Write a protein that binds this DNA or RNA. Sequence first.
RNA 1: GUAUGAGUAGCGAAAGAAGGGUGAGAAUCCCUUCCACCGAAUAUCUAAGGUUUCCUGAGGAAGGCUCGUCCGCUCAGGGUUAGUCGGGACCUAAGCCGAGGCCGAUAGGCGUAGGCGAUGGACAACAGGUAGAGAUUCCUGUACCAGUGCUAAUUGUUUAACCGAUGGGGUGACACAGAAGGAUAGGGAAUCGCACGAAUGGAAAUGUGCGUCCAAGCAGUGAGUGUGAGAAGUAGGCAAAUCCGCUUCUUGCGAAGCAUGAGCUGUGAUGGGGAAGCGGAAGUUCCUGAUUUCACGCUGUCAAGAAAAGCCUCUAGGAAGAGUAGUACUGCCCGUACCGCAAACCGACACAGGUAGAUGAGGAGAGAAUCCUAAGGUGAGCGAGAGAACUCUCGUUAAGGAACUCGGCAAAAUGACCCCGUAACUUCGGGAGAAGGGGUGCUCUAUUAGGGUGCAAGCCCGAGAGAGCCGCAGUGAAUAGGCCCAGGCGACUGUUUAGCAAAAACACAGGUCUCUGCAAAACCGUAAGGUGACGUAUAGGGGCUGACGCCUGCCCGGU
RNA 2: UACCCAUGUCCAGGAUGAAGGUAAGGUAAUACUUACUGGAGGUCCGAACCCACGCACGUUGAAAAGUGCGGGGAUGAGGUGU
Lengths: 44, 273, 92
Amino acid sequence: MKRTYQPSKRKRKKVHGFRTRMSTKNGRRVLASRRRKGRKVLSA
Amino acid sequence: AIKKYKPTTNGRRHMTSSDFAEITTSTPEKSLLRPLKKKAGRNNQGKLTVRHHGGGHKRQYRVIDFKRNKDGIPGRVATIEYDPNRSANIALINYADGEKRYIIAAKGLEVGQTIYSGAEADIKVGNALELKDIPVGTVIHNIEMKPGKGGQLVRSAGTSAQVLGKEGKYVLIRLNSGEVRMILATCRATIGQVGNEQHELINIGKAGRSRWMGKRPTVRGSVMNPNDHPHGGGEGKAPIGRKSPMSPWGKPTLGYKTRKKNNNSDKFIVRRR
Amino acid sequence: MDARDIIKRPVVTEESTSILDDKKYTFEVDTRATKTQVKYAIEEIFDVKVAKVNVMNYKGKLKRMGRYAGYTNKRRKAIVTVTADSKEIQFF
RNA sequence: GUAUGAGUAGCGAAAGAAGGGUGAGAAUCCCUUCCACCGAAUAUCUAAGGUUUCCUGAGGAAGGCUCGUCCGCUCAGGGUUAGUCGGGACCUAAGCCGAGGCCGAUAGGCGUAGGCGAUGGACAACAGGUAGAGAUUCCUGUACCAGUGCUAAUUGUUUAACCGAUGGGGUGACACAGAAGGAUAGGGAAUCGCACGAAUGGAAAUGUGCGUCCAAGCAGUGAGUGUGAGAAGUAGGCAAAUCCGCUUCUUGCGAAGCAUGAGCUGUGAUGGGGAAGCGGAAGUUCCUGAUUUCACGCUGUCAAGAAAAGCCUCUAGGAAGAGUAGUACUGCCCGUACCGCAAACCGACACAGGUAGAUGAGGAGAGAAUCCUAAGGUGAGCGAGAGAACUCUCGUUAAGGAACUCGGCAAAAUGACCCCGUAACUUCGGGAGAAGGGGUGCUCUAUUAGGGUGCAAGCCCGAGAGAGCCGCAGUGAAUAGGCCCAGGCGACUGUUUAGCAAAAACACAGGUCUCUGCAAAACCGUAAGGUGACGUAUAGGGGCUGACGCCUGCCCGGU
RNA sequence: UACCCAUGUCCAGGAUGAAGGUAAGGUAAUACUUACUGGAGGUCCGAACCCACGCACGUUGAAAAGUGCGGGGAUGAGGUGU
Ligand SMILES: [Mg+2]
Ligand SMILES: [Mg+2]
Ligand SMILES: [Mg+2]
Ligand SMILES: [Mg+2]
Ligand SMILES: [Mg+2]
Ligand SMILES: [Mg+2]
Ligand SMILES: [Mg+2]
Ligand SMILES: [Mg+2]
Ligand SMILES: [Mg+2]
Ligand SMILES: [Mg+2]
Ligand SMILES: [Mg+2]
Ligand SMILES: [Mg+2]
Ligand SMILES: [Mg+2]
Ligand SMILES: [Mg+2]
Ligand SMILES: [Mg+2]
Ligand SMILES: [Mg+2]
Ligand SMILES: [Mg+2]
Ligand SMILES: [Mg+2]
Ligand SMILES: [Mg+2]
Ligand SMILES: [Mg+2]
Ligand SMILES: [Mg+2]
Ligand SMILES: [Mg+2]
Ligand SMILES: [Mg+2]
Ligand SMILES: [Mg+2]
Ligand SMILES: [Mg+2]
Ligand SMILES: [Mg+2]
Ligand SMILES: [Mg+2]
Ligand SMILES: [Mg+2]
Ligand SMILES: [Mg+2]
Ligand SMILES: [Mg+2]
Ligand SMILES: [Mg+2]
Ligand SMILES: [Mg+2]
Ligand SMILES: [Mg+2]
Ligand SMILES: [Mg+2]
Ligand SMILES: [Mg+2]
Ligand SMILES: [Mg+2]
Ligand SMILES: [Mg+2]
Ligand SMILES: [Mg+2]
Ligand SMILES: [Mg+2]
Ligand SMILES: [Mg+2]
Ligand SMILES: [Mg+2]
Ligand SMILES: [Mg+2]
Ligand SMILES: [Mg+2]
Ligand SMILES: [Mg+2]
Ligand SMILES: [Mg+2]
Ligand SMILES: [Mg+2]
Ligand SMILES: [Mg+2]
Ligand SMILES: [Mg+2]
Ligand SMILES: [Mg+2]
Ligand SMILES: [Mg+2]
Ligand SMILES: [Mg+2]
Ligand SMILES: [Mg+2]
Ligand SMILES: [Mg+2]
Ligand SMILES: [Mg+2]
Ligand SMILES: [Mg+2]
Ligand SMILES: [Mg+2]
Ligand SMILES: [Mg+2]
Ligand SMILES: [Mg+2]
Ligand SMILES: [Mg+2]
Ligand SMILES: [Mg+2]
Ligand SMILES: [Mg+2]
Ligand SMILES: [Mg+2]
Ligand SMILES: [Mg+2]
Ligand SMILES: [Mg+2]
Ligand SMILES: [Mg+2]
Ligand SMILES: [Mg+2]
Ligand SMILES: [Mg+2]
Ligand SMILES: [Mg+2]
Ligand SMILES: [Mg+2]
Ligand SMILES: [Mg+2]
Ligand SMILES: [Mg+2]
Ligand SMILES: [Mg+2]
């Protein structure tokens, strides 16, 4: 059994990172809504 | 020639190949090589637009001279080589300048001959001339369609076209497919037939040999599901239960003509194949 | 850059005191100071002749006091060795 | 929130025993001895990932499938050192972003110059010490790379030493398979050294145990592997070139000369390490020998096998300072603890699962198979005692030998090496390990006959035979094809429903019909822009049939 | 997880003996025969590695698909990392 989550630092920050969010209109929408709800960690 | 293989195994039983007797050297000219990367039919967007491609031996591009616009310099044939990117072989020509370039190997082109291009060239196999200076009846190849652009019409191995007449600003050519066409008189061509005639006699023999050249398997439409192909479905084997056989996207596939009906070059085509 | 603000404080422990007689001195420095700023700062402050500097970066440990989990501060430690013909530093 | 099932199921692959110690308390913690397990791993490194789990002093509420004085748990202090190792200040691939630009109700999509981006290219350090925790980093000894200043001679100064491109050129720079070599690592014997020299019949020597060395750099050498030499002349190498390319002449070669090149010798060594009793003796000769290196070197084949920087050279250019020798000094940022076939990673768990790479010893052996072991590591986080039914995993069974059953399902049987022998049919390759049989142990002739190695000493390899000897049994253990006759389907190797179906289904090489003259047809997209293709009818797309052999008949009214 | 692109890496041992080549024959010259050489293959047997054909167990599992004993491929239409 090879499971579903195989971790990697680079593969995580390149897909879900802050710069990846800020590079798109919809990623900026995601960041805005997470700021609105009041979450401690944005993106990451 | 064509080399038959002994039936040692079941995959070598029906297999044939060329013996590469005409090829002279096995190393390319380094300063004329460019890299190629496979695309497997993937689009600008990354989508698979043309299917059944991808995953063969890697190759490297050899930049060929189709314009043949070096006029008045005698060019001497140096070697005859192998090109993975086309069915015909190629010949390396180094001029009296010191410059070198590749051209398509014509039939009967041997090492040591001299090759000319221009207006004062003789009518011999390998020379390049404008179509107005070529006498009626000769067999030519590498016909270009717009002046200064480069050869484009007859170029694969064993193919040939024949000059057929004059109409002032145009020249009649009978293309390899059997078509009679009008081409400007200032467009160039090369005298002779194209090199490797036996290329069509090769029996591949193996499925892996098709895989080596970059061909993925072809699934028939009759063994698909109804949402995949207009032919899929049915219990057991099923006939073509339609009015006509169909392509994977509709649009009948047997006998249906797909050339544009309002084409701008219908006045330059004298008679179709 | 105002040498007294890139050298923070001496490190006093058994590990540091053991090498203290080798003319090796352990200090706390800014997290941004480089190996050469430290050397010139030491030469400006203590009036010595520095031979080498080694630096290392420490992470912050994770402590708690019940429902309150947090991280200790971030450290940058420098070991400074002086040349043979130079006066020492006290620490005491 | 609390019951019933109920003191019930379970306590997650495995060998432990006793004697001392600690403690309020011991099967479970520490020490000693014996026993047992892995050993192409359950050993040693090292990426990813984890993120303090590392070390020391205290602790026993909760966690640990039991106990605990213990712990990867709780508390408090500590612990990670680089010019040379891996990554930046060096280079580029796939891909991504993209000034102007093209396209588009808005939003935006595409894309040129340019730039990011290793899984690849280039690049200067080795051997020991380190008793709580780091080591090519600290320390000791000996080095190398780039640069700077200070001294001392040398040379050159605008018919101009010297430097030299963001430009040209060469190299860098490359697939797969096969075979024969050189060398070294490793392994094994003698020799040499130190110690022991003995409990139960024998042995003071043909006895027993352990060891039997050492870098980078510097100076030499070198198995080899590639390899034309000189001189003229220039429609080309965006300008120029003394460099490259092209042509013509002279001179001829497994001979030298040039490049590379494993390894070896001296120094480094007045140093370091090393068996026993803080010191430290000996470190020679021979045999075997790589999956490593020379080296993608050679040969062969077709499916025809990255880019840029770096390095060298050429001019365009810059030029009054320049190298030389000796000395001292300068060299930034990030990672460095610990686990890493695992109790620290992915699986909710201290989970019988999954996890890239380097090294990976001996006997017998073709072998990384197989059994037993070395270095090294472990005894598996519930026990003891009885030896019922039944269930699971194993071992033997008299006579019969498929009578069982949907069906020889399961099990039993064959199994290594050497020799003899072998059918129908065939697409002439096969069928074929067809079938069916025979021989294997130990002693003597015997350091054989003969081979490999060496100058010799010697060492290694080991067929035939004869005579014998012993067992129920001689590949005496483990590991190691059951075979034959006839038919259906598919030609064959391959692929398929992750988790009920592996097949007669899909694919395939081959056949045929049809579309396409190049801004090709076909396909993605509103378009721009693309694939097709850096291709050109011997090419590209679609439908059906599916190796090979013999063949493929009649109907054009309907669609 | 499916297909693709760029760049790396892995596959103990043993068996068979295609093309071609050399020599001796045989010819007017060839064809052809015999020995030696040679090292082909979606070749053969078989570990690592990949897979999942049969049976048994498990089935409030050690495991939300596994284990044990046999089984198929193992130089390629191969396995695998980033
Ligand atoms: Mg197709
Ligand atoms: Mg098909
Ligand atoms: Mg179907
Ligand atoms: Mg439909
Ligand atoms: Mg249908
Ligand atoms: Mg059907
Ligand atoms: Mg039917
Ligand atoms: Mg550091
Ligand atoms: Mg009960
Ligand atoms: Mg019980
Ligand atoms: Mg247990
Ligand atoms: Mg005890
Ligand atoms: Mg054992
Ligand atoms: Mg084993
Ligand atoms: Mg890490
Ligand atoms: Mg974790
Ligand atoms: Mg903690
Ligand atoms: Mg600990
Ligand atoms: Mg307790
Ligand atoms: Mg407890
Ligand atoms: Mg702890
Ligand atoms: Mg150092
Ligand atoms: Mg570095
Ligand atoms: Mg580096
Ligand atoms: Mg713009
Ligand atoms: Mg873009
Ligand atoms: Mg670019
Ligand atoms: Mg980069
Ligand atoms: Mg890298
Ligand atoms: Mg280096
Ligand atoms: Mg440690
Ligand atoms: Mg060390
Ligand atoms: Mg190349
Ligand atoms: Mg006695
Ligand atoms: Mg040396
Ligand atoms: Mg080669
Ligand atoms: Mg470890
Ligand atoms: Mg766990
Ligand atoms: Mg446990
Ligand atoms: Mg586990
Ligand atoms: Mg052996
Ligand atoms: Mg072994
Ligand atoms: Mg041991
Ligand atoms: Mg126990
Ligand atoms: Mg019986
Ligand atoms: Mg019996
Ligand atoms: Mg019987
Ligand atoms: Mg019977
Ligand atoms: Mg019955
Ligand atoms: Mg029946
Ligand atoms: Mg059976
Ligand atoms: Mg003899
Ligand atoms: Mg046996
Ligand atoms: Mg067996
Ligand atoms: Mg089949
Ligand atoms: Mg299934
Ligand atoms: Mg187009
Ligand atoms: Mg278009
Ligand atoms: Mg295109
Ligand atoms: Mg034809
Ligand atoms: Mg057929
Ligand atoms: Mg069919
Ligand atoms: Mg046929
Ligand atoms: Mg018919
Ligand atoms: Mg009709
Ligand atoms: Mg009609
Ligand atoms: Mg690829
Ligand atoms: Mg095979
Ligand atoms: Mg087979
Ligand atoms: Mg599968
Ligand atoms: Mg197997
Ligand atoms: Mg096999």
